[PDB]
């Protein structure tokens, strides 16, 4: 069943992260072990070798494209723009994380301005909460009744992925397997 998660031509944005449910099927990890040598396979909670003996009911598989210097922010108990407003992972996390460079599949010479992240937000998120609202975020004293203007920002901004960039800024495809 590890086909659409890995070998897919379309991945959503950080603020609209995908959520996939895989269950009631054999989940042989033969590909995982052979997934090498550009797949970081940092697993938190259980050893990568000790997976066949374990059993799980719901195997979530998140998937998005982010900057390299932000993949560190997927680790449990961390602070940052990617880990405060877009995607939150609880401290008591039991799951694996797989990240790999995807410059050849998600870059463009002009620049792929199609990946979005919410820069600023009034409150930090809760474990496993979706942020799909695109309302105007107001910080000033003047209350804008859904009217654009100063101190009434639109809290969405686009990336600047390009091939001829440094490795840190190169797009990284990250998939997180959370076991419940």
């Amino acid at each position, epitope marked *: 069943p590890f086909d659409e998660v890995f070998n897919a031509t*379309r991945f959503a944005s950080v603020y*609209a992260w*995908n959520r996939k449910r895989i269950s009631n099927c054999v989940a042989d990890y033969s590909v995982l072990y052979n997934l090498a040598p550009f797949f970081t396979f940092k697993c938190y909670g259980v050893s990568p070798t000790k997976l066949n003996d374990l059993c799980f009911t719901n195997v979530y598989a998140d998937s998005f494209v982010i900057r390299g210097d932000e993949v560190r922010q997927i680790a449990p108990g961390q602070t940052g723009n990617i880990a405060d407003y877009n995607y939150k992972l609880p401290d008591d996390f039991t799951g694996c994380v797989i990240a790999w460079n995807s410059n050849k599949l998600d870059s463009k*010479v002009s620049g*792929n301005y199609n990946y979005l992240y919410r820069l600023f937000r009034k409150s930090n998120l809760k474990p496993f909460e979706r942020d*799909i609202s695109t309302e105007i975020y107001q910080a000033g004293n003047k209350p804008c009744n859904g009217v654009a203007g100063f101190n009434c920002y639109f809290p969405l901004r686009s990336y600047s992925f390009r091939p001829t960039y440094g490795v840190g800024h190169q797009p990284y495809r990250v998939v997180v397997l959370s076991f419940e």
Partner: antibody
Amino acid sequence: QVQLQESGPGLVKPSETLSLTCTVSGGSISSYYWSWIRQSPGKGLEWIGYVYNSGGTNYNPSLRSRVTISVDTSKNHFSLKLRSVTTADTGVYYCARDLGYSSGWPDAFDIWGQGKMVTVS
Amino acid sequence: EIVLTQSPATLSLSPGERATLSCTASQSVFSYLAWYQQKPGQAPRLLIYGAFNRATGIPARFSGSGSETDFTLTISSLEPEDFAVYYCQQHSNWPGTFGQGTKVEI
């Protein structure tokens, strides 16, 4: 076969919302970039936005706040909701679908369906 | 912003006659512009994508090029149909906009 019907029959009174809705007749949404387009005299063909299997979208910055598209993964009643309808929006709208022979870029509008009317009086 | 000034405006022909078209980009399309067709009364349609590749379904005689300023569609066949508008399209710099087009008569 994949006729993209539009069942939303709501015409618009001044300054109210735009309660239109597209519908699907065969085809399955899956992961195509369904979108919306419009055209009228004054300003011709125009692109509002496109939606994914989730809230993945990108809106037109000429008019951005008013236009708020929705997503219906299963019941596929995705709508092009709008607020502060003017006396200028009167035009024939259209419902757009892309081709799945490419990468993450909605570029090739192929499938199309008959449009709709709106007027103020 | 991305702008197109497609020319010309006046043209007349009959079946199986010559043909010529052009598109007037401003800054840079590289190879991502497109050409479309919309007969008068029904929905639009797509003719060319990629600026050098014909799309599926389009018949044998439809092909064009592109270099941001020197686009060329070399066609000389006007079937009993296809006298309608031809629509230029471009999308590389957000947002993407179409063209206006022109016509030919009998």
